[PDB]
């Protein structure tokens, strides 16, 4: 590896480890913010656009209901998410500004990226050209190079988690499945279309699952649909484990070759998991036109700038029923979330 990359990654790991070992806690409180709009809602949490009442800055506040986190067996995952996010620093990761908890909820106050999910833009236009897909893919390659060097596995790569920023670059959101792993881990998590075979088969798995998911993402960006598509999860899983993939004729030969090596069912043969690591990907012919440094430095003009009116515009996100942020008069699940 170029000594330049080695020294960059050594510093990145030093800085991560200092914050990892001494995490920040309790750096804001709920009544510092006004609520604007619900941007997403799930079985144990929500993301809400908020505005800081003193600075006027907008943020995407992730609110997790402690009781539901416990019921759905997400305790460790929520602790992972916050501890990791407060310790990382990379251009293509949404930044965690503040975190805190109260009697009912956990809060992660993230920068608000107003351009919408990649998923929305992909579905709007149908499919991305290869250069357009490659620009986003290159950012994910660099992001995974960074995360994996810190012993982090991301485990939730999918188009909904890639937000398009004011410069047209991606920022990855939702670290709910991210984990610091030396060696193997076992939890079943991730969206069906993106799961690596070794997850489906209940094996001890490693960072190679992220590289598999990159193959799925690149395929979906370039085709408009994912490679193992089927109507129900069990049918998806049968296709994933089969070792067969079909490519649209419009794909270039270089794209097909890269994808066969990312979508390799034998994890010991999968690009990103061989002796040369990420460099088998970065040096592949499909990436021959990619200026990795210029991407990292945000010096490349992006494929498109999302249409939005300002840092508070929510037009690129969807509409959800607006529910209370109620805080119990009694502390819930205090022991479980002590470290948050
Ligand atoms: N020569 C150098 N390259 C960098 C960048 C850009 C790149 O290709 O990889 C880095 C370092 C490793 C993590 C991802 C970002 C920094 S110094």
| Strand ranges (E), 175-253 | 179-180
Give the nearest ligand 1 atom to 2 CA. Answer: 1
- Per the CB < 8 A criterion, the answer to whether 230 and 241 are in contact is no
Q: How many CB atoms lie within 10 A of CB 331?
A: 13
Query: Domain range spanning residue 112?
Result: 23-116+308-340
Active site residue 34: no
Do both 230 and 122 map to the same domain?
A: yes
Residues whose CB is less than 8 angstroms from the CB of residue 127 and which lie 6 or more positions away in sequence, other chains included: 221, 222, 223, 224
What DSSP state is assigned to residue 225?
A: S
Do both 163 and 250 map to the same domain?
A: yes
How many domains would you assign to the chain?
A: 2
Do both 124 and 246 map to the same domain?
A: yes
Probe target for ligand 1 pocket from 2, 4, 8, 140, with the most ligand atoms within 8 Å of CB = 8
Q: CA 64: distance to chain centroid?
A: 18
- Core vs surface per residue 56-87: b (16+ CB within 10 A) or e: eebbbbbbbbbeebbeeebeebbbbbbbbbbb
Do both 191 and 265 map to the same domain?
A: yes
Give the nearest ligand 1 atom to 295 CA. Answer: 6
Do both 108 and 18 map to the same domain?
A: no
Do both 2 and 52 map to the same domain?
A: no
Catalytic residue of the set 31, 151, 156, 165: 156
CA–CA dist 80, 64 (Å, integer):
13
Tokens of 210: 């992220």
Tell whether 204 is in a known binding site.
Answer: no
- Per the CB < 8 A criterion, the answer to whether 133 and 221 are in contact is yes
Do both 322 and 210 map to the same domain?
A: no
With H, G, I as helix, E, B as strand and everything else as coil, classify residue 158. coil
What DSSP string runs through 21-79?
HS-------GGGEEEEEEEEE-SSEEEEEEEETTT--EEEEEEEEHHHHHHTT-HHHHH
CATH code assigned at 3 = 1.10.510.10
Pocket of ligand 1 (CB under 6 A): 2, 4-5, 8-9, 142, 145-146, 292-293, 296
Do both 8 and 76 map to the same domain?
A: no
Do both 140 and 110 map to the same domain?
A: no
CA–CA dist 225, 236 (Å, integer):
13
Tell whether 310 is in a known binding site.
Answer: no
Tokens of 225: 């649909």
Tokens of 32: 């510092």
Residues whose CB is less than 8 angstroms from the CB of residue 3 and which lie 6 or more positions away in sequence, other chains included: none
* Spacing, Cα 34 to ligand 1 middle (Å): 39
With H, G, I as helix, E, B as strand and everything else as coil, classify residue 233. helix
Do both 29 and 87 map to the same domain?
A: yes
* Spacing, Cα 77 to ligand 1 middle (Å): 29
Residues whose CB is less than 8 angstroms from the CB of residue 87 and which lie 6 or more positions away in sequence, other chains included: 16, 17, 19, 20, 23
Identify the CA nearest to 333 among candidates 35, 118, 94, 67. Answer: 67
CATH code assigned at 68 = 3.30.200.20
CA–CA dist 269, 289 (Å, integer):
25
Helices 208-223, 118-125: axis angle to 10 degrees equals 30
CA-based R_g, the chain, Å: 20
Do both 279 and 330 map to the same domain?
A: no
CA distances from 135 to 31, 112, 113 (A): 40, 22, 18
- Core vs surface per residue 11-39: b (16+ CB within 10 A) or e: ebeeebeebbeebeeeebebeebeebebb
Do both 79 and 146 map to the same domain?
A: no
The H-or-E segment that residue 188 falls in is none
Residues whose CB is less than 8 angstroms from the CB of residue 261 and which lie 6 or more positions away in sequence, other chains included: 270, 271, 280, 284
Identify the CA nearest to 77 among candidates 184, 188, 177, 209. Answer: 177
């Amino acid at each position: 590896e170029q000594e330049s990359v080695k020294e960059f990654l050594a510093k990145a790991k030093e800085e991560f480890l200092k914050k990892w070992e001494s995490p920040s806690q309790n750096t804001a409180q709920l009544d510092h913010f006004d609520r604007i709009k619900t941007l997403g809602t799930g079985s144990f949490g929500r993301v809400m656009l908020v505005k800081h009442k003193e600075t006027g800055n907008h943020y995407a506040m992730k609110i997790l209901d402690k009781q539901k986190v416990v019921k759905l067996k997400q305790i460790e995952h929520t602790l992972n998410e916050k501890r990791i996010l407060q310790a990382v620093n990379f251009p293509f990761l949404v930044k965690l500004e503040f975190s805190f908890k109260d009697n009912s909820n956990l809060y992660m106050v993230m920068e608000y990226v107003p351009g919408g999910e990649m998923f929305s833009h992909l579905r709007r236009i149908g499919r991305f050209s290869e250069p357009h897909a490659r620009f986003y893919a290159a950012q994910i390659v660099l992001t995974f190079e960074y995360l994996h060097s810190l012993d982090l596995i991301y485990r939730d790569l999918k188009p909904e988690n890639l937000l398009i920023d004011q410069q047209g670059y991606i920022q990855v959101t939702d670290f709910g499945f991210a984990k610091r792993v030396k060696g193997r881990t076992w939890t079943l998590c991730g969206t069906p279309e993106y799961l690596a075979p070794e997850i489906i088969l209940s094996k001890g798995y490693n960072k190679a699952v992220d590289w598999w998911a990159l193959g799925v993402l690149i395929y979906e960006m370039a085709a408009g649909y994912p490679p193992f598509f089927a109507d129900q999860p069990i049918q998806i899983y049968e296709k994933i484990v089969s070792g067969k993939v079909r490519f649209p004729s419009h794909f270039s030969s270089d794209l097909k070759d890269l994808l066969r090596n990312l979508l390799q069912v034998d994890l010991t043969k999968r690009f990103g998991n061989l002796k040369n690591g990420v460099n088998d990907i970065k040096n592949h012919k499909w990436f021959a036109t990619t200026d990795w440094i210029a991407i990292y430095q945000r010096k490349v003009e992006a494929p498109f700038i999302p249409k939005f009116k300002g840092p508070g515009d929510t037009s690129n996100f969807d509409d959800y029923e607006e529910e209370e942020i109620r805080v119990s008069i009694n502390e819930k699940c205090g022991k479980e979330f002590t470290e948050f």
